[PDB]
């Protein structure tokens, strides 16, 4: 019913945008922490590795740290970030 903008937990409705700085889908947030959309969620949201934003529902989150400077998230070596699995609010894909 309402969009979460921080303190994401499973069940939350979230706004997901194709970020220009990272060339990757991220959750819109006022938090200083990075929340990336997990690559496995792209087909559930009708996205491709090019829609600009989508609403999603949080199913899972995983706290991660970059081990390589050159990675899929374009974050510096050692950056920590969450990876978030999401699905559409009401469509089974």
């Amino acid at each position: 019913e309402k969009i979460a903008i921080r303190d994401f937990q499973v069940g939350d409705l979230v706004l997901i945008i194709l970020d220009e700085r990272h060339d990757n889908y991220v959750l819109f947030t006022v938090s200083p922490t990075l929340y990336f959309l997990h690559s496995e969620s792209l087909p559930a949201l009708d996205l491709k590795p090019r829609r600009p934003w989508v609403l999603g529902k949080v199913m899972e989150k995983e706290y991660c740290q970059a081990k390589k400077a050159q990675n899929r998230f374009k974050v510096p070596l050692g950056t920590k970030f969450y990876r978030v699995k999401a699905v559409s609010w009401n469509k089974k894909v």
Binding site: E62, Y63, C64, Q65, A66, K67, K68, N71, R72, F73, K80
Partner: peptide, 7 residues
């Protein structure tokens, strides 16, 4: 993954 690890 070699790119990142779970903390």
């Amino acid at each position: 993954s070699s790119e990142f690890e779970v903390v």
